[PDB]
């Protein structure tokens, strides 16, 4: 009962969870998949109960409000709207997420990627979203000032006006597109491949180049996936 498309007015109130499987390919061994993509809203004062995670790293993109993230080992970080946070989680450690406001709610999008826990990676990283047409916000080596992932994944944040476009060269054989707000379509080889309404996702296979075109004011993600 989210209305779309031009204003997509209540996007910050939307709550949903995608849960996806783990891909295998005999020619691409041991690589990670996108396992969850969710958007959640926490009420003023509210706070999820601590939880362990199943061999995944967690990337949060704060859309509205502010939150604090704590773990059972004493590590802590706060994130406000406009920031992305990566938690490279550790076996048997519990993690909590609290809304810092007693007055105002919190909205955030969260991705889980499979992780090889023995791979080195900083426990906590944050990145300030620049909000330009496209930004690389996470990558294997933290190229171009991006969050460093211990997966072979490149994550892009897209902000376009209606009718604007952005082109992407893909490293892996799989891409996932996500509408954060607004509608858009993807082209490959100058031909339409998929059209996404507000809040849609779409996996796209074996395209080395993808062009995204906004059909209303848009915020989106494009995830370049290794298998
Ligand atoms: Cl990987
Ligand atoms: Cl496809």
Token pair belonging to 200:
């849609």
Q: Are strands 147-148 and 134-139 parallel, antiparallel or unpaired?
A: parallel
In the reported structure, the alpha carbon of residue 7 is separated from the centroid of ligand 1 by a whole-number distance in angstroms of 36
Bridge partners of residue 154, in order along the sequence = 224
- Core vs surface per residue 207-226: b (16+ CB within 10 A) or e: beebbbbbbbbbbbbbbbbb
Nearest to 147 by CA among 156, 138, 155: 138
83-87 β-sheet, strand order:
16-19, 34-42, 106-114, 56-64, 83-87, 124-128
Token pair belonging to 172:
């892996």
Dihedral sign from CA coordinates of 29, 58, 51, 89: positive
- Which ligand has the nearest atom to the CA of 202? 2
What is the phi/psi pair of residue 67, to 5°?
-145, 155
Technique employed here was X-ray
Number of helices (H), then strands (E), belonging to the chain: the values are: 0, 20
Please, is 159 exposed, middle or buried when counting C-beta atoms within 10 Å of its C-beta (0-12, 13-18, 19+)? buried
In the reported structure, the alpha carbon of residue 175 is separated from the centroid of ligand 2 by a whole-number distance in angstroms of 9
Token pair belonging to 122:
């900083």
Fold of 1-5+130-227: Jelly Rolls (2.60.120)
Ranges for all domains in the chain classified under CATH 2.60.120.10: 1-5+130-227, 6-129
SS3 183: coil
For residue 74, CA distances in Å to 93, 180, 195 come to: 10, 32, 44
- Which ligand has the nearest atom to the CA of 173? 2
From 3.40.50.300, 3.90.1150.10, 2.60.120.10, 1.10.10.10, which CATH number describes the 6-129 domain?
2.60.120.10
Tracing tokens 């796209």 back to the chain, one arrives at 204
In the reported structure, the alpha carbon of residue 19 is separated from the centroid of ligand 2 by a whole-number distance in angstroms of 18
Alpha-carbon distance of 170 to 210, in angstroms, equals: 8
Question: Is the peptide bond between 5 and the residue preceding it cis, with omega within 30 degrees of 0?
Answer: yes
- Which ligand has the nearest atom to the CA of 193? 2
Nearest to 221 by CA among 181, 190, 169: 181
């Amino acid at each position: 009962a989210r209305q779309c498309g031009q204003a997509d007015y209540g996007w910050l109130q939307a709550r949903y969870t995608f849960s996806f499987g783990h891909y295998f390919d005999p020619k691409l061994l041991g690589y990670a998949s996108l396992r969850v993509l969710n958007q959640e809203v926490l009420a003023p004062g509210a706070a999820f109960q601590p939880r362990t995670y199943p061999k995944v790293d967690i990337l949060n993109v704060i859309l509205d409000g502010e939150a604090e993230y704590r773990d059972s080992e004493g590590n802590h970080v706060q994130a406000s709207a406009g920031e992305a946070l990566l938690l490279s989680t550790q076996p048997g450690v519990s993690y909590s997420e609290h809304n810092l406001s007693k007055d105002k709610p919190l909205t955030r999008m969260q991705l889980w990627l499979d992780a090889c826990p023995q791979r080195e990676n900083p426990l906590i990283q944050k990145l300030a979203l620049n909000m330009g047409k496209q930004q690389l916000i996470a990558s294997p080596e933290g190229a171009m000032g991006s969050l460093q992932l211990r997966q072979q994944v490149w994550l892009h944040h897209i902000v376009l006006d209606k009718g604007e476009s952005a082109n992407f060269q893909l490293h892996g054989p799989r891409a996932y597109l996500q509408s954060i707000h607004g509608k858009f379509h993807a082209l490959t080889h100058h031909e339409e491949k998929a059209a996404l309404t507000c809040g849609d996702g779409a996996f796209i296979r074996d395209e080395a180049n993808i062009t995204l075109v906004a059909d209303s004011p848009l915020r989106a993600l494009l995830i370049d996936l290794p298998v």
